[PDB]
């Protein structure tokens, strides 16, 4: 597989990346506490937002409104309007670092998760917390909404992946599955957009694929390779492929049905922390120690 690199930012370490739905922009949230807005067509730094102390691990655009959300090691979830260029409000509530934050695709909700061992759901119009999901016994490193069902998947350093039934779209939330298999902490999880599958990535250097029925869930297979912690993973939305990124300085592509290696991409001296895909285009971004790369695959 070929990587067609479209843009590379050079910066201090980047942690999060978010693709705008219609403009050729990405937000990149940095370890230094700054949030950068880049035009990746021209390669221009359009703006920089300063509203956190310490790393900014979570970053996401709203799908239709001129809003983005950021989440930081200062424990805050911040909501911004990028047209007016203003920080609108802070959702404080988390009691330790925020690891992820994202908007729901339809409801006026923000999802966040934290080292405080909770996943929280906020209504961004009323600006209050509407749900707190407890159960993990260590940091929650990742949480994500299912694209079509009332489910959330989360990953924790407690070595489990959890699937939560959220119900309460209309207690609010119950744990449906607890997935054990990783022998070390789990850093990331993802839903397939259409199949009942989940991917996870761990400090065991493994990416695991799981499947769900209405009543059961279990481990399908393992992507073996990576020689350090696997930071992030996702399903290719248009091909039967798995993508993963790791502190071993590689992005790897694997076949979804076989878990065989397809391609490895390396950087000389940059650990990878995060990968994402554009919500409409076949466009990917990866965050690493020296900035962010935006690329297409074959």
């Amino acid at each position: 597989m070929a990587m067609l690199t479209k843009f590379e930012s050079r910066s201090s370490r980047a942690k999060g990346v978010a693709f705008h739905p219609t403009q050729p922009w990405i937000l990149t949230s940095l370890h230094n506490g700054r949030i950068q807005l880049w035009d990746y067509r021209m390669g221009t730094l359009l703006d920089r937002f300063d509203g956190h102390d310490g790393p900014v691990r979570g970053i996401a655009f709203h799908p239709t409104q001129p809003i983005f959300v950021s989440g930081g090691d200062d424990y805050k979830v911040n909501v911004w309007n990028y047209k007016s260029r203003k920080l609108l409000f802070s959702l404080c509530g988390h009691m330790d670092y925020v690891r992820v934050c994202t908007f729901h695709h339809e409801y006026p909700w923000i999802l966040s998760c934290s080292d405080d061992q909770t996943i929280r759901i906020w209504n961004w119009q009323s600006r209050n917390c509407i749900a707190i999901l407890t159960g993990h016994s260590h940091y929650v490193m990742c949480a994500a909404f299912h694209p079509s069902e009332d489910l959330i998947v989360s990953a924790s350093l407690d070595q489990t992946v959890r699937v939560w039934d959220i119900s309460g779209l209309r207690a609010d939330a119950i744990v449906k599955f607890v997935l054990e298999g990783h022998d070390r902490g789990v850093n990331w999880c993802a839903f397939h957009p259409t199949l009942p599958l989940i991917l996870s990535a761990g400090d065991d250097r493994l990416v695991k694929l799981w499947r769900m029925t209405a009543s059961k869930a279990w481990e399908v297979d393992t992507c073996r390779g990576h020689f350090n912690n696997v930071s992030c993973c996702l399903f290719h939305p248009h091909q039967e492929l798995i993508l993963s990124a790791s502190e071993d300085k590689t992005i790897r592509v694997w076949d979804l049905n076989r878990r065989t290696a397809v391609q490895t991409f390396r950087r000389a001296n940059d650990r990878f922390w995060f990968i994402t895909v554009h919500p409409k285009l076949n466009l990917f971004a990866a965050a690493h120690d020296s900035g962010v790369m935006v690329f297409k695959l074959e």
Binding site: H31, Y97, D115, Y139, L157, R271
Partner: peptide
């Protein structure tokens, strides 16, 4: 005492 700081 904390982990995953990078």
């Amino acid at each position: 005492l904390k982990t995953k700081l990078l």
